[PDB]
Scaffold this active site. Structure first.
Site, PDB file in Angstrom:
ATOM      1  N   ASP A 194       0.844  -1.195   0.000  1.00  0.00           N
ATOM      2  CA  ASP A 194       0.000   0.000   0.000  1.00  0.00           C
ATOM      3  C   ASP A 194       0.882   1.248   0.000  1.00  0.00           C
ATOM      4  OD1 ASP A 194      -1.908   1.959   0.333  1.00  0.00           O
ATOM      5  OD2 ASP A 194      -2.484   1.354   2.358  1.00  0.00           O
ATOM      6  N   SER A 236      -0.751  15.504 -12.343  1.00  0.00           N
ATOM      7  CA  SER A 236      -1.005  15.084 -13.714  1.00  0.00           C
ATOM      8  C   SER A 236      -1.278  16.303 -14.586  1.00  0.00           C
ATOM      9  CB  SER A 236      -2.189  14.114 -13.773  1.00  0.00           C
ATOM     10  OG  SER A 236      -2.561  13.830 -15.115  1.00  0.00           O
TER      11      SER A 236
HETATM   12  N1  LIG Z   1      -4.426   3.245   0.475  1.00  0.00           N
HETATM   13  C1  LIG Z   1      -4.174   4.013   1.678  1.00  0.00           C
HETATM   14  C2  LIG Z   1      -5.000   5.298   1.711  1.00  0.00           C
HETATM   15  C3  LIG Z   1      -6.364   5.253   1.951  1.00  0.00           C
HETATM   16  C4  LIG Z   1      -7.103   6.426   1.985  1.00  0.00           C
HETATM   17  C5  LIG Z   1      -6.475   7.644   1.779  1.00  0.00           C
HETATM   18  C6  LIG Z   1      -7.266   8.950   1.817  1.00  0.00           C
HETATM   19  F1  LIG Z   1      -8.605   8.687   1.821  1.00  0.00           F
HETATM   20  F2  LIG Z   1      -6.939   9.638   2.952  1.00  0.00           F
HETATM   21  F3  LIG Z   1      -6.946   9.700   0.724  1.00  0.00           F
HETATM   22  C7  LIG Z   1      -5.112   7.687   1.542  1.00  0.00           C
HETATM   23  C8  LIG Z   1      -4.376   6.515   1.506  1.00  0.00           C
END
Ligand SMILES: NCc1ccc(C(F)(F)F)cc1
Length: 330
Positions: free
Chosen positions: A35, A199
């Site tokens: 992630d 972007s």
């Molecule tokens: N995949 C991790 C993640 C999940 C949600 C967010 C948000 F909603 F804060 F943009 C950022 C990062």
């Protein structure tokens, strides 16, 4: 040194990708969701509430000769979809595709939300955002990438996600056989702790490219593509019968429709997302309404270049002192 690991979609819609990770001595292999939108390495463990575990493989620190409790440390994290988890912290040896880090913070989940429990294929998360987002208190902990950086040949990792097919996460080198043409690099802002970039515009199908700046994050842990309402409305306006549904929670379209491609800009380069990548299938078994892979970011407050976009490209996460993001067609 370098590492390389295969990542595999968890289901037929590419909702998430799992990558095997070795933790402990002797190794305990868990399938983690890599992630780039978070910075915690947390796993289901023998400390997780028994009712909150449904088929996941669990980390057992008591069976690891290298595990050490990080005395006093706790963690609590909440994701943008409402998911959450919390527990204590161990340090242990962690290996990804031959790349080994000693003393990596392994956050043992004592409590997990319902969405993790019902996903038996994902044993945990491996965060690859910047360490400033790590939730360990009172001593903030470094990510796997940060701890491995010094020993890597180059301080980079690459994401090569497949469409309905396995892909590759590489650490420490760039596989020049994995992409076509040149890699276009673009600047990253670390101000919010994300791989945040800008972007240069977009196009819908074979339409004219609209030059406009779209700030967003490169997030392997998010399934869909979340873009401003103006962009998402212009895309779905080209699909006969598409509409935003309040009861479903986003744009849906007749499953009989064919979807146009979506192009996003990286500097002067263009990355084309084939229309088939935007089809996420019927909203319920047997339904003729299908769920769209491009949705509005208005509810979220940040634009997210999730798996829908990233799997159309070879993506370099350059963790040099001045970080950059590289995009290549493949
Ligand atoms: N995949 C991790 C993640 C999940 C949600 C967010 C948000 F909603 F804060 F943009 C950022 C990062």
């Amino acid at each position: 040194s370098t590492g390389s690991a295969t990542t595999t979609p968890i289901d037929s819609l590419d909702d998430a990708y799992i990558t095997p990770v070795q933790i402990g001595t002797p190794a305990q292999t868990l399938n983690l969701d890599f992630d780039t939108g978070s910075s915690d390495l947390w796993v289901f463990s023998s400390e997780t509430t028994a009712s909150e575990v449904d088929g996941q493989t669990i980390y057992t620190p008591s069976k690891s000769t290298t595990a050490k409790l990080l005395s006093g440390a706790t963690w609590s994290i909440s994701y943008g979809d409402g998911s959450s988890s919390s527990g204590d912290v161990y340090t242990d040896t962690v290996s990804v595709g031959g790349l080994t880090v000693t003393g990596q913070a392994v956050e043992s989940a004592k409590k997990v939300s319902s969405s993790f429990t019902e996903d038996s294929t994902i044993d945990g998360l491996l965060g690859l955002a910047f360490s400033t987002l790590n939730t360990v208190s009172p001593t903030q902990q470094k990510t796997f990438f940060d701890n491995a950086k010094a020993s890597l040949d180059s301080p980079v990792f690459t994401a090569d996600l497949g469409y309905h097919a396995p892909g590759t996460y590489n650490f420490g080198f760039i596989d020049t056989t994995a992409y076509t043409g040149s890699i276009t690099y673009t600047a990253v802002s670390t101000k919010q702790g994300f791989w945040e970039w800008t972007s240069t515009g977009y196009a819908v199908g074979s339409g004219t490219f609209k030059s406009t700046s779209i700030d967003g994050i490169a997030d392997t842990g998010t399934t869909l593509l979340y873009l401003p309402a103006t962009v998402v409305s212009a895309y779905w306006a080209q699909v006969s019968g598409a509409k935003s549904s309040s009861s479903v929670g986003g744009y849906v379209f007749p499953c009989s429709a064919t979807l146009p491609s979506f192009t996003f800009g990286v500097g002067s380069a263009r990355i084309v997302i084939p229309g088939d990548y935007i089809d996420f299938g019927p909203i319920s078994t047997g339904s003729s309404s299908c769920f769209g892979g491009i949705q509005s970011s208005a509810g979220i407050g940040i634009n997210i270049f999730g798996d829908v976009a990233l799997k159309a490209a070879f993506v370099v996460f350059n963790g040099a002192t001045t970080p950059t993001l590289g995009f290549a067609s493949k």
